[PDB]
Every structure is written in structure tokens, then in C-alpha cells.
């Protein structure tokens, strides 16, 4: 049964563990890969994660032998156990209900192609406009009435580029648009539905210290501009997320260097400039070093709920760390010093 | 289709062994996580193994670090074949005859949460009351009418702790009472169903030479005292069983040392303090040391009878050694040297 | 659904390869078990191998730390994918078409304990009745109309012990008669259903270079003898196959060593004492030592056929070796040398 | 459901790649096995990737302990998760829609048999006709109506052989007939369905420099040639495609040395002489070292679509080297670098 995603997201008060990847103490001697910025996405039966690898195992960079692999939430990456998924130096995944769409690009920083994969087969692609490395969100693509959108970016790390929204159906891309957005720059989008609508928070790498975002419909109508909490322009993915007109911003502690993680609501953040906050609690301390960070979400399909639950993974620096994942609840919790 | 647990425990006249875990001559040269105090529990269709570890494997405790992870009964616990649960320096688990609940404590020794899993799922949380340790069973959790019961202890390992019972339903805390057990100590409780009741065998480390008990029904109306074979007042988690006014004991041969292991049968020994019985069999020899035990059920929903068949597990030290387990026959038996 | 086992043992003309297992090549680096005798017992799904062994694993006997385990066939007998079954040091196993029956026997030698298992489940016992080593079949138990049958013997190995056959269903032992067959010894019964009858060839280790054979029907009426092709007496476990008056021997090349293997058709060998036969085919050529042999099935609700169709498994000594499995057919084949 | 495979082959503008097999790097301190030739053929469900070996581990040929194991596609060829098929020097394989048919050959070069298995039961043999090494397609086999054919080659690599196609149903030769085609020599033929008939292009070791191909209906009605991009002849295992009087050639770009791979539509190339062609595509660069090739299909029955989608394989030489496949798109593609 394919997903509605009609549903609002959980008011949560509070962030509690879920599982731990890419553990390192397993792999002293054990056959496990080397992987870097995992995601999780969840289907309707199970969570699971989603990495890309050279093949490279512990104890023994855009690559066409680069490829994407998976398995089960909080299970250990090794050779034996990974399921492959597609060949790809940046790539998202995401299940609408009825199976895998995941999303690839593999090819030269010239010329390179996504190849969109459902269930297994190739059902399309979508080849480079702007030919300078086409990339997508390294995460969860969302999915809302049996459709699965994305957001894709092709250009300078460092300048103007040019960003295109797809809504996929079954594998194909059945629409798309350009952006307009003079100004602004979108990597790395973190996206998840909400109220059958679709919102990405996206990286600026150009000259954002703060985060931009892009909300749009089923129809690709958008709206764009940044957190406020400057509503103008003013790094490491990231997520935040929108209740009314409050949001829930995951952040390090520090400014100048990747210390702690902290989740803050801020009621009139969205569109607010003030740095009132009425919450905070610590997901990492400060000793530790926080790094790319991201979220997902637990349908109504899967949680047996009426609303959807969000969740975020944060990986730790320490070199490649272990990749945490929290999920929201409305229950008493406490700060987290891993 | 869920678990009734409305029909008797089934009268065993011997115990004759299931499965051994654990092994560690296969750990040699084989990837093998290193665990300690492993637990049973069973579904519907299968029995299954838990375990805690922070990844450390052999040839290679409260931390945020450590979880919960599982492999079916006798199987190798191994990095490619165990399950994630949950995150937890503290836990226990069982199945309610749809999905299984997954109870983990984490966080601080001052401030630790217990995160309730569904079926994978975070679905509520309960925070230290009286911030010193939260602890629970280490064990299986007893399902009586498709809910969930278990018995929690927060306070000091050597004096008057508060102590605590929770009804839970597909994950949520819906019920919870306080108990009035003054100069009782309840650690390490081991549960099972009977006849629509909950029987709970713990742990006295304060001042109990002998072991008390609590005993409720779903509405967590209870009865305390000790087992009398002093019925009041007079150490390593074990368990008994209780037919009538008599009890099969699970206890060392040895007073002073963790030597050999025997069931007694002492038919009036629930309520009375004489040491008479009718039956005793060896379980585990002198020489051997025993360690840890526990109680675990196999419902008719898994067995096919019209009864609930009484089995349990005992840790051989050795050291680690090995988790033997052993169900309950009516039929002929014999000693076990292992 | 329950086997029937009604139908008559399929006309074969010859014998072709099925499986190779215990292969050691794999096993030079890789983590795979140290195993002897390995049988073959198929369900309707799936041909699966079952072995003893202590966990020791290659590049790294009666024992209560002896278990039986079992992978599919063909497959590596490894720690990461064998499945347990019992505990025992001697130990038998088939499948009625609903679950899997296991026997398996643990314990001292001078008093012995069968364990029966039902799907994983403790059924029922059999204490020993001689107090001499209880030993069973090490083979496939044969099942007719939802039942499985099997031979137990206790006694010497060298004199006249007793044997006892018990019809067993779904696990529990509901009939069992003592055998009168004075000078008679059978160890290490092969047993087959044919037309709703239970045939077993069996090794005589006291004065017979001949077999034995019994056959006996559902209730447990019994007739015994000798494969005439003397019909009373004249060793390494061995099967053969009835058809009639004829029989097809799994037998050596050479008499006075374990010197090739190869499958006679001698058409009036069952009651005669005539060294005739019309037709041989070479399983295994004279240079290989040939060791173990025994028989299992293939049903018709397995096969799509409306026959049983005879198979067997020879272990080659090279030692360990390999144990390779053939099945029969009606088609052309011919000579193998491995 | 039974394959139809009454639907055309998909037009295809591009070809895109789908995953990497026998990855080495993993191979450094993994347990993988050391296979050469693998190759690819899809269930309903999933594809899945066939190879043989001798059980040689890397970092650790006819021959009778010679196997043939499959693992899913991508997926690591290690003995941990490798499934046996059967036992053979040389074997081809293909789902019906129902079970799996395995074909494969052993036994010495002077009498070698067939072996055909259908869901792992033996159904049949086939016995050398010319006794001079018989051998198969090392690929997919084609299925159309529920039954699946095959061209298997008996007598000298580099002289006149006797061919002959069979057709199998259910794991039995229910019809088979032998080629007239002098001066034709046909190994290794790569074969696909297309609209309910099968169309086989084949390796001429002897005096071709082109490749001859067969075509036959379900009566194995029959005819031959070359493909004239002369029409009559002028190795290593190859692969094309017909679409009407047009042919896709996958061939090296070298013509004296095994350099580069591209694939070439030549739209009057199955008829025509002459050296024009319409589009092009590199799939291998010049540098690399391109080796075997073949195809294999993914039927409707799998994809959701209304025709036939043609897929293939290059193994690059580097040595073992990877195996990888590309599947035919209708969308923008690029030339591919490995
Ligand atoms: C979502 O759509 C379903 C019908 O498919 C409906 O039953 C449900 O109430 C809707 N939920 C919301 C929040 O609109
Ligand atoms: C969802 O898609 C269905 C068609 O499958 C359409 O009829 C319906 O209007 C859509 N609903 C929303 C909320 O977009
Ligand atoms: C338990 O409840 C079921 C109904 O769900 C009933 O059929 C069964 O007899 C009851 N067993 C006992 C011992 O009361
Ligand atoms: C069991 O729960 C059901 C509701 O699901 C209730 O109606 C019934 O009375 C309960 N029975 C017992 C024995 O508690
Ligand atoms: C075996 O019994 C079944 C009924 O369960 C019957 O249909 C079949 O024909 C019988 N076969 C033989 C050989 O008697
Ligand atoms: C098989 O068992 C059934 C009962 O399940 C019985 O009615 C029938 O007579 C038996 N048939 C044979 C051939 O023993
Ligand atoms: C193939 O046969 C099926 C019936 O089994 C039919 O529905 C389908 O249209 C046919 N396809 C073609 C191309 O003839
Ligand atoms: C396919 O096979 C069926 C029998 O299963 C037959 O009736 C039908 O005519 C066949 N169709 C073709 C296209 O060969």
C-alpha cells in the first residue's frame, strides 16, 4: 500500500536514542567496510541505512567503482551482509509504500548521470544541464500520495548554480522545474513531508552562515528564503523542523569549530530574527566533535500512529566516527554525552 | 495474534537441556561479539537470545555505547547475524504475540531514561524517580491478555530502594504502581504468567539469604514475602516456580561458593520453612562453578498444549563459559555433568 | 501438509551427482566447522545436511557439549549460517510435512537420554533400557501418514543387544516394541518408506559381512533377515534398496580395504544367494577411499512426482574428506571418478 | 505465473550501467571465492549472479569438484551467502516464472553428462553424442511459454562439431533436434526471446572473425548465418540484438587486441555488408582490458512493462579483473571510463 503522507508531523518535546552505525570497535578484526555520511531512510516494514563504498574493508572521492550499499538499521556494514543497491558517487533513497527508489549519480564531473532505480530496475535517468558535478542530497527522499520528489544541484560549490526539483513516480520523472533563487545555494537538502507538502532544508556553502530552504506543493509551486532565527543570506548538512511558525534547529555548540550538538525550539524562529528560544537539550557534548547531520521520518504506515514521527542521525567526527540517530517523542528525556 | 497467557503452568517432574549459547570454542579464530549474562525469551515462532555488548569481539559495564542485540536460540552471536534492538547498559524483552517490546535503560547513573521500543519503534520513555541507578530484569518480560508487565528498581544496591510496576501495551506505559515493600530489595526480578497472574522471583543483595517475591495481577493489585523454605528475611539472580503451595528451586549445591547447580522440588515450600522435599536432579556438577540464572515461558500459542511449559537458563562461569538452557518435561530425566 | 508416503520407491536405472558438502579447499582461511558423517534429510521446501560437531573450527567422541546442527545442502557448513537443532552426541532427524522432527541422544554412558524435539520444542523422552551408550540411526528417520519411525539400539557392540523401534507423532512417542532377533546386531539402521512400509538396512558389527535388514509396517509388525545376495549371517554404516526381489548394493570394490564405491542391481538379491547381477555402475573409482554411506528420500511432495525417489550420500575418507551426495534416475549416466 | 515472453524486445538509445560483480578490493582480507566468466539471469523477483569454483578462496578447468553457486546481484561472491546450484565444468541457467533450471555438465571429457535440475530436484540427463567434450552457454538460457530452450555443442574447438538445440520443460527434453550447418561453428551462444521466438548469437573458434547466429521457434524450426556487418563466415563469448533488419554489436574497439568495449547500432547491419553505422556509444575505454561479454533479458514480468528489456555483461580482463552489467534505456546516457 503506497504512503499518503497527508498527515501533520509529531509535536515532539522532547530527542531519545535509536541506533548506533558504523561501529569501529567491531571492526579491529571483523570484515566491515569503510563507509562516510551514512543516511536512514525507513520503509513500512523496516529502517535501514545506506552508505557508499569502494569495496575498501578496515584493516586491509568520485569513483565509477564507487557504489551504494545497505543494511538493516543498527546492523554492521560487512561484505557479508550488505545488499547493493546501485553504482554512484552521490546518491538518496527513499520507499513509497510499495518499494525502493534510489536515486544515483556515477559518470565524470563533466558529464555525469543520475540513474533512477525502482525496485531494482532502471526506469530512467536525468543527464547533466549546467556539466559541472551533478550531486543530490546524500539522504531521504520524500514521499507524499504514492509520489517521491528530490532536489538536485548542478554548478559551483562556491557560486551561483542551478537547482531543479523532480517529483518521481515508479522510477520515471514525470515533472520537474528550475529554481529561480538569485542569491541563494542549496546542497545537501534535507527534505520530509508534511501536510502533503514538501520541505527542504538545505546547505549553503557559498555565504550562509545561516541555513535556506525551499518548501513546495505536489505540483512543484515553490517558496523560498532562510531560517530567520536575517531572513536573508547572512559548512556541514543539516536539518531543522517546521511547526507553525517555530522550529526545532539541530546545531553544534560551538561557532568556529564542530563542538556538541544541541537541538533548540525557537516558537517564532521560522520567521523571527531574535535568539529567544524557550527549550534546548544536548544531543552531544562539547568534548566530542559533531559532523554532518540530517533527518528522516516514521510514517503513520509504519509507527501505527496518526501523525508522522520525525528522527535525525548526527555522525560523530571523533575520522569517521559512528553515525547516532535519535527520534522524537513527546516523553520526559535527558541531555546525551556520548 | 496475541499472547492470552490465561491457562496453568504445566507440572514438569524433571528438566531435560534445550540449547547451549555462548560457545567459545568456535569464537577461537571466529568474529564472536564477547558477552556476559545472556537472557531467553520466545516468540510465536521462534526462541531467541539477548544479549548486551559494546562490539568488542574475542581475538581482538554502563556505557552509552553498549546495546542490545540478538541472534535465534543456539546460534553463534557473531557480528553478521546478530540483530540491533536498542541501545541500553540495562534491558530485558518479550513478545506479546504480535511484535516484540523492547525495554533499554541509557543515559546517566544519575539521571538514566528507559526508552520503550515497538516493534522497532520508540513509543514512550520513563525517567529515574529517584535518580541512583535505574535498573530492570535482565530477563524476560511476562504477557498476560496482549500487555506486558515488568518490575523496575531505582535506589541503592545495599539498602531500601523504591520499586516499581509497569503494565505496558504495544509500547505505552499505561499503568504503574509504587510497592510497599519495607526492608525488601527486589533486583533482577525474573517474571512469568500464570493462569492470568504475574509471579516474580528477585534478588535480595541487602540483607537475604533466601529470595522474596512478588506476586500481581493485571491491574497491579500485589502480595509480597519471601520464599519460606523464614518467610521474611533471613547474590547472583535466580528463580523458582510456583505450583500450589510448593516450589522447584533453582540453587548452587555449595552455601559459601558458586558450586554445581540443582532443582528441588518442596511441595509445601512456598509457605512453609522446612527443609523436606520430595525430588531433586542434578542440573550442573560440583566441580563446574555456576553462575547467573533465570526463568523464561514457551506459551501453547508456541507449543501446542493446552498449558505453559516452565523452562530457564543457567550461566556455567567457568570467566564467561557458557549460557546452558533447559525446559521442563514429564517425563524421564537423568543428572547433567557438564 | 503431512507426508503420505503411499507411494512406491521410483524405478531407477542408474545414479547421478545431487550436492558436494564438507568441501576443506573453502576451508583453508575460511571460518567453517570440523565435521564427520554428515546426512542428508529432505523436506518439502528444501534437502538440507545435518552434522555433530563441537564448535571447533578447522585452522584453529561422546560429549554433553556435542551439538547437532544443520545448513542447507550444498552450503558450507559454517558458524555464520548453521542453524542449531538439539543436544546430543548421537542424533537422527526427518520432516513429516509440517515441521521438523529431531532425536537426539545426551548424556553419560550409563544412562543415556533421547531427547525428541518437535519444531524446535521439547516433546518427549526415552531413557536408556540396557544402561550401555543409546545410540540411534545417524541417518533420515522415515515418515508415513504424518508419523516418523526410527531403530534405537542399547547394548554391546560386539554381542547381542536390544532394539527397540518407536513410532513417533509430532514428537511424542505413542507406540514402541522390542525386536526378538537373537544373533542378529543392528547399528546405524538406513531407513526408507515404500508403499506405506518402512524398509532398514543396517550395519552388524558382531559376526555379519553381510547386512541385516528390517522391515515392519504403522503398527509396528516386524520381519527380519539378511540381504541374501547367505540369508542369515556371515563394519561401516551402508544402505541398499528393495524392489521387489531385487536389490540395488551400495557397496566397496575391494573387500579387505575402503577401496571405491559402486551400486549393484542384482534383480533377485533380496532371497538369493547367487552372485549374478545385471547391471554396475562405478560411484567412486578404486584409487579414493570410500567410508560412511547411507540413505534418504525425496517425496513426492517435493518432487512434483508420483514416486519416492531413492538418493544417498557416500563420505569420502581421502581424514575427513567430502561427502558427496547422488540421487536416482531413469536416464542415461555414467562412471564417476572424483 | 509461467514466463510469456510473447512481447517484443524494447527499443533501446542507450545503455546504462546496473551493477559490479566480483569485486577484489573487498577480496584483500574478505573470505571471497576466486571465480572467472560469471553470469547474469533474472527471476520475476530478483536477478542473480551465477559463477563456478573450486571452493579456492583468494588470499589462500573440468574438473568433478567443480561447482556452480550464485549469489544476488552485486552481492559478494563469499561462502557465507553463495547458494549451491549444482555440479558442473560448464552450466547455463534461467528462470520459467515458476522454479529455476539449472543445467549443468560433469564427468570426464570422453563421456561427459548433462545434468538438468529443476528447484534443486535432478529431472533428467543428456549424454555426449560425439564424445569429444560437451559443453553449454555459459549464460542465461530463454524461456517462452513456460518453456525454456538451450544449444549445447559436442565435438572439436576448431573444427566441424555436431550442435544441438533442446527444449526443456519442467526439467525434461521433451523435444530436441540437431543443427545442418556445415562450415558453422557455434559455442558459448548468448541467447535471448523476442516476440516468442529465440534468437541465439554464438563464438566461432574456428573461421569467422564475425558471429554466426540461430534462430528457432518453439518447434525448433531453424535458421542460420552471419551477421553480415560478409553474411557468411570470414574468440571470445559475445552478444547482439535484432530489431528488425538493425543490429546493436557489442564488440572491443580494437580489432588485433582486447581493448575498449563499445556498442554500435547498425540499423541495416544484420542484413548489410557495409560498415556504416547510426550511433555509438563507449561502454569500456581503450586503456582497460575488455574480455568476455553476454546478455541476458528482463522480462515484463518483472520490470512493469509491456516489452522486453535487453541487458548484458563485460567481464574486464585487467586477471579476473569485475564483471560489470549496463541494462538498455531509451533515456540520455554517456560513455562510461572504468
Ligand atoms: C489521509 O488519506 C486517507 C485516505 O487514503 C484518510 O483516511 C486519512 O484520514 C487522511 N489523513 C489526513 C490527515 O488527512
Ligand atoms: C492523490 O493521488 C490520487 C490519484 O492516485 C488523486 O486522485 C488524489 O486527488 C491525490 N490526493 C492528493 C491529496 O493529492
Ligand atoms: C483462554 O482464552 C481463550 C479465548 O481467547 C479460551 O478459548 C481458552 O479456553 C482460555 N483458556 C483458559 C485456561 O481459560
Ligand atoms: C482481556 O482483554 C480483553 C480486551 O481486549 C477484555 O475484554 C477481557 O475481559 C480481558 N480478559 C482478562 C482475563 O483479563
Ligand atoms: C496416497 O493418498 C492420497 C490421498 O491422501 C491419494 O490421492 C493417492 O492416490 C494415494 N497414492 C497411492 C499410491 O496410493
Ligand atoms: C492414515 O491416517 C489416517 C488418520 O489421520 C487414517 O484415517 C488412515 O486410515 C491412515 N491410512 C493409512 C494408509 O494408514
Ligand atoms: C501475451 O499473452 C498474454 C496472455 O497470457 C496477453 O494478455 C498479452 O497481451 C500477450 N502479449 C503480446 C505482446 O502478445
Ligand atoms: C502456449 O502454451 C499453451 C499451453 O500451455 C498453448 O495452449 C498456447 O497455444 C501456447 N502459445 C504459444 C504462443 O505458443
Not at 543498527?74 to 561484505?79: A, E, I, L
Amino acid at each position: 500500500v503506497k504512503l499518503a503522507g497527508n498527515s501533520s508531523l509529531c509535536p515532539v518535546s522532547g530527542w531519545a536514542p535509536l541506533s548506533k552505525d558504523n561501529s569501529v570497535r567491531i571492526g579491529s578484526k571483523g570484515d566491515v567496510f569503510v563507509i562516510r555520511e551514512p543516511f536512514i531512510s525507513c520503509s513500512p516494514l523496516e529502517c535501514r541505512t545506506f552508505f557508499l563504498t569502494q569495496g575498501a574493508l578496515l584493516n586491509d572521492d568520485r569513483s565509477p567503482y564507487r557504489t551504494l550499499m545497505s543494511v538493516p538499521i543498527g546492523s554492521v556494514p560487512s561484505p557479508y551482509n550488505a545488499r547493493f543497491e546501485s553504482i554512484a558517487w552521490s546518491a538518496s533513497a527513499c520507499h513509497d509504500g510499495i518499494n525502493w527508489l534510489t536515486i544515483g549519480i556515477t559518470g565524470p564531473d563533466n558529464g555525469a548521470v543520475a540513474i533512477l532505480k525502482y525496485n531494482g530496475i532502471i526506469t530512467d535517468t536525468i543527464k547533466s544541464w549546467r556539466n559541472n558535478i551533478l550531486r543530490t542530497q546524500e539522504s531521504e527522499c520524500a514521499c507524499v500520495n504514492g509520489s517521491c520528489f528530490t532536489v538536485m544541484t548542478d554548478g559551483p560549490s562556491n557560486g551561483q548554480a542551478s537547482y531543479k526539483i523532480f517529483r518521481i513516480e515508479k522510477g520515471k520523472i514525470v515533472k520537474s522545474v528550475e529554481m529561480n533563487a538569485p542569491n541563494y545555494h542549496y546542497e545537501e537538502c534535507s527534505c520530509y513531508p508534511d501536510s502533503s507538502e514538501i520541505t527542504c532544508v538545505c546547505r549553503d556553502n557559498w555565504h550562509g552562515s545561516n541555513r535556506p530552504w525551499v518548501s513546495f506543493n505536489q505540483n512543484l509551486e515553490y517558496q523560498i528564503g532562510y531560517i530567520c532565527s536575517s531572513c536573508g543570506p547572512v559548512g556541514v548538512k543539516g536539518f531543522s523542523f517546521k511547526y507553525g511558525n517555530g522550529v526545532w534547529i539541530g546545531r553544534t555548540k560551538s561557532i568556529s569549530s564542530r563542538n556538541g550538538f544541541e537541538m533548540i525550539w525557537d516558537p517564532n524562529g521560522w520567521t523571527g530574527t531574535d535568539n529567544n528560544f524557550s527549550i534546548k537539550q544536548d544531543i552531544v557534548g562539547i568534548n566530542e566533535w559533531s559532523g554532518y547531520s540530517g533527518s528522516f521520518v516514521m510514517h503513520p504506515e509504519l509507527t501505527g500512529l496518526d501523525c508522522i514521527v520525525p528522527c535525525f542521525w548526527v555522525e560523530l567526527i571523533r575520522t569517521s566516527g559512528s553515525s547516532i540517530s535519535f527520534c522524537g517523542v513527546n516523553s520526559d528525556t535527558v541531555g546525551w554525552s556520548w
